[PDB]
C-alpha cells in the first residue's frame, strides 16, 4: 500500500541518525548501496543494526534471513524470524523524498508542464513540479475535462506541505494521497480529481536509441520509480503457503499468486494436494507464457503434468543445472536418444542440436498407457548466461528468442511457452519481457509505441518480482535497441542491394 520505508537517496550515517532521532526500538528502513546491494537498517535497544540484502538477478537474499521476490514481500513477511549471533521489524520509518513518484517531475517549468499535460495527459492527469520561482515551494498541475490545466500552489513551511489552507502534511506524498481520496473543489464547482499521473515512459520504438542515451546520461531513477509500485502487487499466495506445498517451492517465500497460478488436474487421490506447482500463467495485456522455477527432484513429475495439461510445445530454460556449486534445476529431461518415465508421463529425447549460446533438445511427450497423446516439445536451453549480472551484448539472447518465437509460431494449437530459470522471477522475467516487447515491434513494425516499465508492472501483477534488478532493466532496453537496429539494417541492405 505505501513503500514509504524505502529511502532512495540516503547514506549509512544519515539512516542511523534518522532511526535514533525520528524512530524507536523496532523501527526500520530499507536503503540502496558498492552498488547492486541493499541494506535493512533496524533500531533495537537504542542501537542501529544494518542487515545486508544482495540481488545478483535471481531474488533478494537477506543475510541471516530468507530469499524474497520483492523488498515489499520481504517487509510484509517479517511484519506478519530475524536473529543476531532477534531483530524485530515493527515500525516503518517513512521517507519524504518524492523523486521515485510517478507524478513528481520537479525539474519542469510552468510552460513545459502545461504542454505535456495537453499532448499526453487526459481527464484526471496530474503532476507535481518545483516552483518556479518561489524557491522551496511546489506546484500541482491538474487536467480536467473542452478541457483545462489547473495549477495549485503547494507551500513548504517549516518542513510541512499545504495547499494554502487546512491540513499540514509531512511530505508531498501524504498531501497527494489525501487530495486523491478527498478532491479539491474550485470556486465554480470544478472537482480537481487526481486520477492518474502523467506518463513519461512511453516511447516510439524507432526513437529507442535517443531514450537509451538520455537514460544513460536515468536508468536507475526510472527503475526505482517502477520499484516504488510493487506495494500494489501484494496479492494472496495462500496455496503456496499450504503445509503440503512447502517442499514444492525452490525458495519457501517465492510463491505464485493464487489468481494466476497453474492449477494441476487429474493428479492422484492418494496424495491429498496434487493441484500445485510453483508456476503462473503470464497473459500479456495471443502468445502466453508459464513463468516457473527450476525443477526440484520432487516436482519433475508435476512439471511434466503441467506441460502436457497446458499443451505447451516450447520450453525455455535460462539456467545451467548447476551454477557456483549450487543446484539451480534438477535434470527433468532424458539423455540424448534415451526414454524416461516421469510418473504418468513419458519423455523421449529425440535429438540434441548445439548452437553457440544454447542447446536444443527435441523431446517427445506422452501419457503412459495412452496411445495418440504424443506431441513434440522443443526445449531451448540457454547455457551462456553469466552466474551474476547480465550478458554484455544482447545478440545471443535475441537470436535465441527469435528462434523460440519461430518454433512457437510453427505449431498449430500450441499452449503457453514454458519459461524457467532458478526461482523463476529474474532471468524468467527478463526473457518474457524482452519477448513481449519484441512481439509488438514484430507485428506493428519499427514505428509503434512501447512502454518498458508499464509492461514489467503488468507482468509483475501476474508473478511476484518478475525482472529482479536494474542490470536486467537496462539489458531489456539494450535488447529492444539491438532488435530495432538489426531490423533497420535489414531495410538498409534491401534498398541498397
Short mmCIF file of C-alpha atoms in Angstrom, two decimals:
data_model
loop_
_atom_site.label_atom_id
_atom_site.label_comp_id
_atom_site.label_asym_id
_atom_site.label_seq_id
_atom_site.Cartn_x
_atom_site.Cartn_y
_atom_site.Cartn_z
CA UNK A 1 0.00 0.00 0.00
CA UNK A 2 2.84 2.50 0.78
CA UNK A 3 6.58 1.50 0.39
CA UNK A 4 7.42 4.70 2.32
CA UNK A 5 10.00 2.64 4.35
CA UNK A 6 12.35 2.79 1.29
CA UNK A 7 14.68 5.83 1.12
CA UNK A 8 16.36 6.01 -2.37
CA UNK A 9 18.84 8.85 -1.62
CA UNK A 10 20.12 8.12 1.92
CA UNK A 11 23.61 7.33 3.36
CA UNK A 12 24.63 4.90 6.17
CA UNK A 13 25.26 7.57 8.84
CA UNK A 14 22.15 9.54 7.64
CA UNK A 15 19.95 6.41 8.15
CA UNK A 16 21.41 5.84 11.68
CA UNK A 17 20.69 9.46 12.81
CA UNK A 18 17.14 9.21 11.33
CA UNK A 19 16.33 6.00 13.30
CA UNK A 20 17.85 7.42 16.53
CA UNK A 21 16.03 10.83 16.28
CA UNK A 22 12.71 10.01 14.48
CA UNK A 23 12.31 6.32 15.43
CA UNK A 24 12.01 3.88 18.37
CA UNK A 25 13.03 0.23 19.02
CA UNK A 26 11.53 -1.87 16.20
CA UNK A 27 11.77 1.00 13.69
CA UNK A 28 13.27 0.13 10.30
CA UNK A 29 14.05 1.33 6.80
CA UNK A 30 15.45 -0.11 3.55
CA UNK A 31 18.15 1.67 1.54
CA UNK A 32 20.34 1.13 -1.58
CA UNK A 33 24.16 0.85 -1.54
CA UNK A 34 29.25 -0.61 -3.71
CA UNK A 35 26.07 -0.70 -5.94
CA UNK A 36 23.63 -3.57 -6.66
CA UNK A 37 23.26 -4.18 -2.88
CA UNK A 38 20.56 -3.08 -0.38
CA UNK A 39 20.52 -2.58 3.40
CA UNK A 40 17.76 -3.06 6.00
CA UNK A 41 18.57 -0.54 8.83
CA UNK A 42 16.77 -1.56 12.07
CA UNK A 43 16.78 0.06 15.55
CA UNK A 44 16.97 -2.34 18.56
CA UNK A 45 17.72 -1.44 22.26
CA UNK A 46 18.84 2.14 21.41
CA UNK A 47 21.30 0.78 18.79
CA UNK A 48 21.04 0.66 14.94
CA UNK A 49 21.84 -2.62 13.10
CA UNK A 50 22.47 -2.92 9.34
CA UNK A 51 21.39 -6.14 7.54
CA UNK A 52 22.76 -6.75 4.02
CA UNK A 53 20.43 -7.63 1.09
CA UNK A 54 22.06 -8.79 -2.15
CA UNK A 55 20.50 -9.31 -5.57
CA UNK A 56 22.63 -10.67 -8.46
CA UNK A 57 19.44 -11.20 -10.52
CA UNK A 58 17.52 -14.14 -9.01
CA UNK A 59 16.00 -12.92 -5.69
CA UNK A 60 16.57 -10.64 -2.69
CA UNK A 61 18.86 -12.60 -0.37
CA UNK A 62 18.69 -11.17 3.17
CA UNK A 63 21.73 -12.18 5.33
CA UNK A 64 20.62 -14.38 8.26
CA UNK A 65 17.13 -14.30 6.72
CA UNK A 66 15.31 -15.63 3.65
CA UNK A 67 15.16 -15.20 -0.16
CA UNK A 68 12.39 -12.90 -1.47
CA UNK A 69 10.73 -11.84 -4.73
CA UNK A 70 10.44 -8.14 -3.69
CA UNK A 71 11.53 -5.85 -0.85
CA UNK A 72 7.77 -5.31 -0.19
CA UNK A 73 7.18 -9.10 0.22
CA UNK A 74 10.32 -9.23 2.46
CA UNK A 75 8.87 -6.46 4.72
CA UNK A 76 5.30 -7.96 4.76
CA UNK A 77 6.77 -11.38 5.81
CA UNK A 78 8.68 -10.12 8.91
CA UNK A 79 5.86 -7.69 9.90
CA UNK A 80 3.25 -10.58 9.91
CA UNK A 81 12.28 -14.65 12.07
CA UNK A 82 15.40 -12.43 12.01
CA UNK A 83 18.23 -13.16 14.53
CA UNK A 84 21.74 -11.97 15.59
CA UNK A 85 24.73 -14.15 16.90
CA UNK A 86 16.35 -11.27 17.48
CA UNK A 87 15.68 -8.36 15.02
CA UNK A 88 12.05 -7.06 15.00
CA UNK A 89 10.50 -5.08 12.09
CA UNK A 90 7.71 -3.19 13.92
CA UNK A 91 7.58 0.43 12.67
CA UNK A 92 8.38 1.54 9.07
CA UNK A 93 10.32 4.86 9.08
CA UNK A 94 8.67 6.86 6.25
CA UNK A 95 10.56 8.77 3.51
CA UNK A 96 9.58 12.31 2.39
CA UNK A 97 11.68 12.25 -0.84
CA UNK A 98 9.21 12.31 -3.80
CA UNK A 99 11.87 11.54 -6.52
CA UNK A 100 10.65 7.90 -7.05
CA UNK A 101 6.99 9.03 -7.51
CA UNK A 102 5.33 8.79 -10.97
CA UNK A 103 3.60 12.19 -10.51
CA UNK A 104 6.81 14.02 -9.43
CA UNK A 105 8.82 15.89 -12.08
CA UNK A 106 10.38 18.77 -10.12
CA UNK A 107 12.73 19.98 -12.93
CA UNK A 108 9.69 21.02 -15.07
CA UNK A 109 8.74 24.67 -15.73
CA UNK A 110 5.20 26.15 -15.96
CA UNK A 111 5.21 26.24 -19.79
CA UNK A 112 6.58 22.64 -20.12
CA UNK A 113 4.10 21.14 -17.57
CA UNK A 114 1.10 22.67 -19.46
CA UNK A 115 2.48 21.43 -22.84
CA UNK A 116 2.96 17.82 -21.54
CA UNK A 117 -0.50 17.76 -19.85
CA UNK A 118 -2.09 18.97 -23.15
CA UNK A 119 -0.38 16.47 -25.54
CA UNK A 120 -0.01 13.41 -23.20
CA UNK A 121 -2.47 13.92 -20.32
CA UNK A 122 -6.25 13.24 -20.21
CA UNK A 123 -9.03 13.89 -17.59
CA UNK A 124 -7.61 13.40 -14.08
CA UNK A 125 -3.97 13.55 -15.27
CA UNK A 126 -1.79 15.39 -12.76
CA UNK A 127 1.83 16.27 -11.90
CA UNK A 128 3.92 17.90 -9.12
CA UNK A 129 6.86 20.20 -10.02
CA UNK A 130 9.12 22.58 -8.14
CA UNK A 131 8.44 26.36 -8.20
CA UNK A 132 9.22 28.44 -10.26
CA UNK A 133 10.24 30.66 -8.59
CA UNK A 134 9.07 30.84 -5.13
CA UNK A 135 12.02 28.66 -4.12
CA UNK A 136 11.24 25.75 -1.76
CA UNK A 137 7.56 25.67 -2.85
CA UNK A 138 5.94 23.15 -5.26
CA UNK A 139 3.25 23.38 -7.98
CA UNK A 140 0.44 20.79 -8.54
CA UNK A 141 -0.71 20.84 -12.20
CA UNK A 142 -4.05 19.01 -12.97
CA UNK A 143 -6.08 18.39 -16.19
CA UNK A 144 -9.93 18.28 -16.12
CA UNK A 145 -12.44 17.69 -18.95
CA UNK A 146 -13.25 21.38 -23.85
CA UNK A 147 -10.55 20.77 -21.17
CA UNK A 148 -8.23 22.87 -18.88
CA UNK A 149 -4.90 22.71 -16.95
CA UNK A 150 -5.35 23.97 -13.33
CA UNK A 151 -2.36 24.96 -11.15
CA UNK A 152 -2.44 24.64 -7.33
CA UNK A 153 0.34 26.19 -5.22
CA UNK A 154 1.98 23.93 -2.58
CA UNK A 155 3.82 25.86 0.14
CA UNK A 156 6.65 24.24 2.10
CA UNK A 157 6.56 25.88 5.57
CA UNK A 158 8.85 24.51 8.35
CA UNK A 159 9.31 21.07 6.63
CA UNK A 160 5.48 20.64 6.20
CA UNK A 161 3.39 20.92 2.97
CA UNK A 162 -0.01 22.60 2.34
CA UNK A 163 -2.35 23.97 -0.42
CA UNK A 164 -2.71 27.35 1.39
CA UNK A 165 -5.21 26.10 3.99
CA UNK A 166 -6.45 23.13 6.01
CA UNK A 167 -4.06 20.30 6.98
CA UNK A 168 -0.21 20.46 7.01
CA UNK A 169 1.49 17.30 5.61
CA UNK A 170 4.90 15.73 6.48
CA UNK A 171 5.56 15.03 2.75
CA UNK A 172 4.27 15.70 -0.81
CA UNK A 173 3.11 12.00 -0.93
CA UNK A 174 0.92 12.50 2.20
CA UNK A 175 -0.51 15.66 0.55
CA UNK A 176 -1.09 13.99 -2.90
CA UNK A 177 -2.70 10.82 -1.39
CA UNK A 178 -5.04 12.96 0.78
CA UNK A 179 -6.20 15.06 -2.21
CA UNK A 180 -6.56 11.85 -4.33
CA UNK A 181 -9.11 10.49 -1.77
CA UNK A 182 -10.51 13.96 -0.80
CA UNK A 183 -10.54 16.09 -4.03
CA UNK A 184 -10.22 19.91 -4.08
CA UNK A 185 -13.28 21.78 -5.42
CA UNK A 186 -12.77 25.09 -7.32
CA UNK A 187 -14.85 28.31 -6.79
CA UNK A 188 -17.21 27.48 -9.72
CA UNK A 189 -17.62 23.77 -8.80
CA UNK A 190 -14.84 22.03 -10.83
CA UNK A 191 -13.58 18.92 -8.96
CA UNK A 192 -9.77 18.59 -9.16
CA UNK A 193 -9.68 14.77 -9.37
CA UNK A 194 -6.19 13.24 -9.15
CA UNK A 195 -6.93 10.04 -11.14
CA UNK A 196 -3.59 9.07 -12.76
CA UNK A 197 -0.06 10.60 -13.07
CA UNK A 198 1.45 11.85 -16.36
CA UNK A 199 3.10 9.09 -18.47
CA UNK A 200 6.82 9.99 -19.02
CA UNK A 201 7.97 6.44 -20.07
CA UNK A 202 6.05 5.54 -23.29
CA UNK A 203 8.36 5.99 -26.28
CA UNK A 204 8.19 5.27 -30.01
CA UNK A 205 10.11 2.04 -30.81
CA UNK A 206 12.04 3.87 -33.61
CA UNK A 207 13.24 6.55 -31.06
CA UNK A 208 14.73 3.92 -28.62
CA UNK A 209 18.38 4.97 -29.36
CA UNK A 210 17.68 8.56 -28.18
CA UNK A 211 15.84 7.40 -24.98
CA UNK A 212 18.60 4.83 -24.19
CA UNK A 213 21.23 7.65 -24.42
CA UNK A 214 19.10 10.12 -22.34
CA UNK A 215 18.71 7.34 -19.69
CA UNK A 216 22.50 6.65 -19.86
CA UNK A 217 23.23 10.38 -19.18
CA UNK A 218 18.27 7.99 -15.72
CA UNK A 219 18.12 4.13 -15.88
CA UNK A 220 18.38 3.83 -12.05
CA UNK A 221 15.74 6.60 -11.43
CA UNK A 222 13.27 5.01 -13.94
CA UNK A 223 13.76 1.55 -12.33
CA UNK A 224 13.26 2.86 -8.75
CA UNK A 225 10.03 4.66 -9.81
CA UNK A 226 8.81 1.26 -11.14
CA UNK A 227 10.16 -0.45 -7.96
CA UNK A 228 8.07 2.00 -5.80
CA UNK A 229 4.89 0.46 -7.41
CA UNK A 230 5.40 -3.15 -6.04
CA UNK A 231 3.33 -2.45 -2.91
CA UNK A 232 0.25 -2.51 -5.21
CA UNK A 233 1.16 -6.16 -6.12
CA UNK A 234 0.95 -7.93 -2.73
CA UNK A 235 -1.77 -10.37 -3.90
CA UNK A 236 -2.52 -13.54 -1.89
CA UNK A 237 -0.13 -16.51 -2.26
CA UNK A 238 -2.11 -18.83 0.10
CA UNK A 239 -1.86 -22.08 -1.95
CA UNK A 240 1.96 -21.95 -1.93
CA UNK A 241 1.88 -21.29 1.86
CA UNK A 242 -0.01 -24.61 2.47
CA UNK A 243 1.90 -27.15 4.65
CA UNK A 244 1.60 -29.89 1.99
CA UNK A 245 3.02 -27.48 -0.70
CA UNK A 246 6.08 -26.19 1.29
CA UNK A 247 8.53 -28.74 -0.23
CA UNK A 248 7.36 -27.96 -3.82
CA UNK A 249 8.91 -24.45 -3.64
CA UNK A 250 12.60 -23.81 -4.51
CA UNK A 251 12.53 -20.76 -2.13
CA UNK A 252 9.89 -21.02 0.66
CA UNK A 253 8.83 -17.33 0.31
CA UNK A 254 8.93 -17.01 -3.51
CA UNK A 255 5.38 -18.16 -4.25
CA UNK A 256 2.86 -17.95 -7.13
CA UNK A 257 -0.18 -15.63 -6.92
CA UNK A 258 -3.36 -17.70 -6.36
CA UNK A 259 -5.24 -15.82 -9.14
CA UNK A 260 -2.70 -16.67 -11.93
CA UNK A 261 -1.16 -19.95 -10.60
CA UNK A 262 -1.16 -23.08 -12.77
CA UNK A 263 -3.75 -25.48 -11.32
CA UNK A 264 -2.93 -29.17 -12.00
CA UNK A 265 -5.85 -31.56 -12.70
CA UNK A 266 -6.22 -35.41 -12.85
CA UNK A 267 -3.50 -35.98 -10.22
CA UNK A 268 -3.73 -38.83 -7.69
CA UNK A 269 -6.47 -39.17 -4.99
CA UNK A 270 -3.95 -40.82 -2.55
CA UNK A 271 -1.85 -37.61 -2.27
CA UNK A 272 -4.15 -35.00 -0.55
CA UNK A 273 -2.87 -31.96 -2.56
CA UNK A 274 -1.93 -32.78 -6.20
CA UNK A 275 -3.03 -29.47 -7.84
CA UNK A 276 0.10 -27.38 -7.02
CA UNK A 277 3.15 -26.21 -8.93
CA UNK A 278 5.23 -23.04 -8.35
CA UNK A 279 4.20 -21.55 -11.72
CA UNK A 280 1.97 -18.80 -13.13
CA UNK A 281 0.25 -18.14 -16.47
CA UNK A 282 1.61 -14.87 -17.96
CA UNK A 283 -1.02 -13.24 -20.23
CA UNK A 284 0.20 -10.00 -21.96
CA UNK A 285 -2.41 -7.21 -21.57
CA UNK A 286 -2.04 -14.12 -28.37
CA UNK A 287 1.33 -15.63 -27.18
CA UNK A 288 1.12 -16.54 -23.44
CA UNK A 289 3.80 -17.90 -21.09
CA UNK A 290 4.17 -20.06 -17.98
CA UNK A 291 6.76 -18.49 -15.70
CA UNK A 292 8.13 -21.22 -13.46
CA UNK A 293 11.01 -22.23 -11.19
CA UNK A 294 13.76 -24.76 -11.95
CA UNK A 295 12.62 -28.29 -11.07
CA UNK A 296 13.18 -29.83 -7.65
CA UNK A 297 13.56 -33.64 -7.74
CA UNK A 298 10.12 -33.99 -6.06
CA UNK A 299 8.44 -31.63 -8.69
CA UNK A 300 9.80 -33.09 -12.01
CA UNK A 301 6.59 -35.23 -12.31
CA UNK A 302 4.37 -32.18 -11.62
CA UNK A 303 6.41 -30.19 -14.21
CA UNK A 304 5.55 -32.79 -16.93
CA UNK A 305 1.89 -32.96 -15.80
CA UNK A 306 1.87 -29.13 -16.33
CA UNK A 307 3.47 -29.16 -19.84
CA UNK A 308 1.07 -31.95 -21.01
CA UNK A 309 -2.11 -30.40 -19.45
CA UNK A 310 -1.26 -26.91 -20.75
CA UNK A 311 -0.47 -28.31 -24.25
CA UNK A 312 2.93 -26.50 -24.22
CA UNK A 313 5.28 -27.22 -27.11
CA UNK A 314 8.22 -24.94 -26.21
CA UNK A 315 10.36 -24.93 -23.01
CA UNK A 316 12.74 -22.00 -22.42
CA UNK A 317 15.48 -22.90 -19.87
CA UNK A 318 17.64 -19.89 -18.84
CA UNK A 319 19.96 -21.56 -16.31
CA UNK A 320 22.58 -24.31 -16.17
CA UNK A 321 21.58 -27.21 -13.87
CA UNK A 322 24.48 -26.11 -11.59
CA UNK A 323 25.81 -22.59 -11.02
CA UNK A 324 28.51 -21.63 -8.44
CA UNK A 325 28.39 -25.19 -6.97
CA UNK A 326 24.60 -24.90 -6.30
CA UNK A 327 21.74 -26.92 -7.90
CA UNK A 328 19.54 -24.42 -9.84
CA UNK A 329 17.46 -27.01 -11.75
CA UNK A 330 17.23 -30.82 -11.45
CA UNK A 331 17.59 -32.63 -14.84
CA UNK A 332 13.92 -33.23 -15.89
CA UNK A 333 14.77 -34.30 -19.49
CA UNK A 334 16.32 -37.68 -20.53
CA UNK A 335 19.77 -38.06 -22.17
CA UNK A 336 20.01 -37.85 -25.97
CA UNK A 337 18.27 -40.95 -27.55
CA UNK A 338 17.04 -42.07 -24.05
CA UNK A 339 13.42 -42.59 -22.99
CA UNK A 340 12.26 -41.84 -19.41
CA UNK A 341 9.02 -42.14 -17.43
CA UNK A 342 8.21 -39.27 -15.00
CA UNK A 343 5.20 -40.63 -13.12
CA UNK A 344 2.26 -40.91 -15.58
CA UNK A 345 4.33 -39.03 -18.23
CA UNK A 346 6.81 -40.46 -20.70
CA UNK A 347 9.52 -38.32 -22.34
CA UNK A 348 11.79 -39.30 -25.26
CA UNK A 349 14.80 -37.10 -26.15
CA UNK A 350 14.78 -37.50 -29.97
CA UNK A 351 17.75 -35.28 -30.93
CA UNK A 352 20.05 -32.60 -29.48
CA UNK A 353 21.38 -29.73 -31.60
CA UNK A 354 24.01 -27.38 -30.15
CA UNK A 355 24.40 -23.69 -31.01
CA UNK A 356 26.94 -21.20 -29.52
CA UNK A 357 24.68 -19.86 -26.70
CA UNK A 358 22.15 -22.71 -26.37
CA UNK A 359 21.23 -26.38 -26.87
CA UNK A 360 18.00 -27.52 -28.49
CA UNK A 361 16.52 -30.81 -27.31
CA UNK A 362 13.74 -32.34 -29.37
CA UNK A 363 11.55 -34.12 -26.81
CA UNK A 364 8.52 -36.33 -27.38
CA UNK A 365 5.97 -36.25 -24.51
CA UNK A 366 3.02 -38.62 -23.93
CA UNK A 367 0.91 -40.16 -21.16
CA UNK A 368 1.95 -43.77 -20.24
CA UNK A 369 -0.59 -46.37 -21.42
CA UNK A 370 -2.24 -43.73 -23.65
CA UNK A 371 -1.70 -44.11 -27.39
CA UNK A 372 -2.08 -40.95 -29.58
CA UNK A 373 -1.23 -38.46 -26.74
CA UNK A 374 2.32 -37.94 -28.13
CA UNK A 375 3.41 -34.39 -29.01
CA UNK A 376 6.86 -32.90 -29.70
CA UNK A 377 8.16 -30.46 -27.03
CA UNK A 378 11.10 -28.24 -28.01
CA UNK A 379 13.44 -27.38 -25.16
CA UNK A 380 15.67 -24.37 -25.80
CA UNK A 381 18.29 -24.45 -23.05
CA UNK A 382 20.23 -21.12 -22.93
CA UNK A 383 23.66 -22.04 -21.41
CA UNK A 384 25.86 -18.91 -21.55
CA UNK A 385 24.01 -16.52 -19.17
CA UNK A 386 26.56 -15.23 -16.55
CA UNK A 387 26.41 -16.51 -12.91
CA UNK A 388 25.90 -12.86 -11.71
CA UNK A 389 24.51 -9.85 -13.60
CA UNK A 390 23.52 -9.92 -17.32
CA UNK A 391 25.33 -10.56 -20.72
CA UNK A 392 27.42 -7.67 -22.22
CA UNK A 393 25.73 -7.96 -25.66
CA UNK A 394 22.05 -8.98 -26.22
CA UNK A 395 22.70 -10.52 -29.69
CA UNK A 396 22.82 -14.12 -28.41
CA UNK A 397 19.60 -13.72 -26.31
CA UNK A 398 17.79 -12.04 -29.29
CA UNK A 399 18.92 -14.82 -31.73
CA UNK A 400 17.71 -17.37 -29.14
CA UNK A 401 14.27 -15.65 -28.68
CA UNK A 402 13.78 -15.21 -32.50
CA UNK A 403 14.34 -18.98 -32.88
CA UNK A 404 11.95 -19.69 -29.92
CA UNK A 405 9.26 -17.41 -31.47
CA UNK A 406 9.52 -19.08 -34.93
CA UNK A 407 9.14 -22.62 -33.40
CA UNK A 408 6.13 -21.49 -31.27
CA UNK A 409 4.52 -19.82 -34.37
CA UNK A 410 5.15 -23.00 -36.48
CA UNK A 411 2.95 -25.16 -34.13
CA UNK A 412 -0.85 -25.28 -34.58
CA UNK A 413 -2.79 -25.14 -31.25
CA UNK A 414 0.43 -24.82 -29.11
CA UNK A 415 -0.16 -23.79 -25.46
CA UNK A 416 1.82 -21.27 -23.33
CA UNK A 417 5.62 -21.15 -23.72
CA UNK A 418 7.11 -22.60 -20.53
CA UNK A 419 9.90 -20.26 -19.29
CA UNK A 420 12.10 -21.06 -16.22
CA UNK A 421 15.44 -20.25 -14.54
CA UNK A 422 16.19 -20.91 -10.81
CA UNK A 423 13.49 -19.15 -8.69
CA UNK A 424 11.69 -18.24 -11.99
CA UNK A 425 11.40 -14.45 -11.48
CA UNK A 426 14.61 -12.64 -12.53
CA UNK A 427 16.01 -14.19 -15.74
CA UNK A 428 12.50 -15.65 -16.45
CA UNK A 429 11.01 -12.14 -16.07
CA UNK A 430 13.76 -10.65 -18.26
CA UNK A 431 13.23 -13.15 -21.13
CA UNK A 432 9.37 -12.89 -21.14
CA UNK A 433 9.53 -9.03 -21.02
CA UNK A 434 12.05 -8.81 -23.95
CA UNK A 435 9.92 -11.33 -25.90
CA UNK A 436 6.67 -9.34 -25.24
CA UNK A 437 8.24 -6.00 -26.34
CA UNK A 438 9.88 -7.57 -29.45
CA UNK A 439 6.46 -9.18 -30.30
CA UNK A 440 4.94 -5.62 -30.53
CA UNK A 441 7.73 -4.49 -32.97
CA UNK A 442 7.32 -7.76 -34.96
CA UNK A 443 3.58 -7.13 -35.71
CA UNK A 444 3.40 -3.26 -35.72
CA UNK A 445 6.81 -2.50 -37.30
CA UNK A 446 9.64 -0.14 -36.20
CA UNK A 447 7.21 2.80 -35.59
CA UNK A 448 4.95 1.74 -32.66
CA UNK A 449 4.54 2.82 -29.03
CA UNK A 450 6.40 0.81 -26.32
CA UNK A 451 6.42 1.33 -22.50
CA UNK A 452 9.13 -0.81 -20.77
CA UNK A 453 8.19 -0.22 -17.03
CA UNK A 454 4.43 -0.39 -17.87
CA UNK A 455 4.97 -3.86 -19.40
CA UNK A 456 7.10 -5.00 -16.42
CA UNK A 457 4.34 -3.81 -13.97
CA UNK A 458 1.65 -5.78 -15.92
CA UNK A 459 3.90 -8.95 -15.79
CA UNK A 460 4.73 -8.38 -12.04
CA UNK A 461 0.94 -8.36 -11.34
CA UNK A 462 0.89 -12.00 -12.66
CA UNK A 463 4.03 -13.45 -10.86
CA UNK A 464 5.93 -11.90 -7.93
CA UNK A 465 9.01 -9.76 -8.74
CA UNK A 466 9.30 -10.53 -12.50
CA UNK A 467 12.57 -8.71 -13.52
CA UNK A 468 14.76 -8.52 -10.38
CA UNK A 469 17.50 -5.91 -10.97
CA UNK A 470 18.42 -2.58 -12.63
CA UNK A 471 21.01 -4.59 -14.69
CA UNK A 472 18.18 -6.66 -16.26
CA UNK A 473 16.05 -3.49 -16.68
CA UNK A 474 18.88 -1.78 -18.63
CA UNK A 475 19.50 -5.10 -20.53
CA UNK A 476 15.78 -5.14 -21.59
CA UNK A 477 16.29 -1.60 -23.07
CA UNK A 478 19.58 -2.73 -24.75
CA UNK A 479 17.90 -5.83 -26.30
CA UNK A 480 14.97 -3.77 -27.71
CA UNK A 481 17.56 -1.21 -29.04
CA UNK A 482 19.64 -4.03 -30.68
CA UNK A 483 16.46 -5.55 -32.23
CA UNK A 484 15.33 -2.22 -33.77
CA UNK A 485 18.91 -1.56 -35.07
CA UNK A 486 19.01 -5.09 -36.61
CA UNK A 487 15.51 -4.54 -38.18
CA UNK A 488 16.52 -1.16 -39.70
CA UNK A 489 19.87 -2.60 -41.01
CA UNK A 490 17.75 -5.24 -42.90
CA UNK A 491 15.77 -2.38 -44.60
CA UNK A 492 19.12 -0.51 -45.37
CA UNK A 493 20.59 -3.67 -47.08
CA UNK A 494 17.43 -4.33 -49.19
CA UNK A 495 17.01 -0.78 -50.64
CA UNK A 496 20.81 -0.66 -51.45
CA UNK A 497 21.12 -4.22 -52.98
#
